[PDB]
Design a binder for this molecule. Structure first.
Ligand SMILES: CCOP(=O)(O)OC[C@H](O)CO
Lengths: 49, 65
């Protein structure tokens, strides 16, 4: 308008994952035979989403 | 992780050496091999008195949990 500017919605956000823391276991045983051884496978990685 | 197909030790205690399967397979030979002397009456069915303990050992000790 001509008196005061209305605010607008805004959002970002970030889902960062460091080490895996892988463991060882195985141881051884074986048976067959051969072988075984121781280585531890068992790592089993995880998705960052 | 583990698995959901086992983890109960149920089929191992039922179909194994120290179970009841070894008893139902030892009486089936004498039920028909010791009564076939009527029509045949010949020394022929005598090669099965030693292969019972051998067949049960070459199949159960394959995986062994
Ligand atoms: C001699 C032991 O028995 P078998 O090997 O079953 O004999 C084969 C013929 O049937 C003999 O008649």
């Amino acid at each position: 308008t001509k008196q005061w500017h209305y605010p607008s919605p805004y959002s970002r956000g970030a889902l960062s994952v460091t080490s895996i823391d892988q463991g060882a276991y195985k141881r051884s045983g074986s048976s067959w035979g051969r072988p075984y051884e121781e280585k531890a496978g068992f790592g089993f990685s995880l998705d960052a989403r | 992780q583990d698995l959901m197909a086992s983890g109960n030790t149920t089929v191992k205690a039922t179909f194994g050496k120290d179970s009841s399967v070894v008893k139902w397979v030892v009486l089936a030979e004498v039920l028909v091999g010791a009564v076939m002397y009527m029509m045949t009456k010949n020394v022929k069915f005598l090669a099965g008195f030693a292969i019972i303990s051998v067949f049960i050992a070459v199949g159960m000790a394959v995986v062994g949990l």
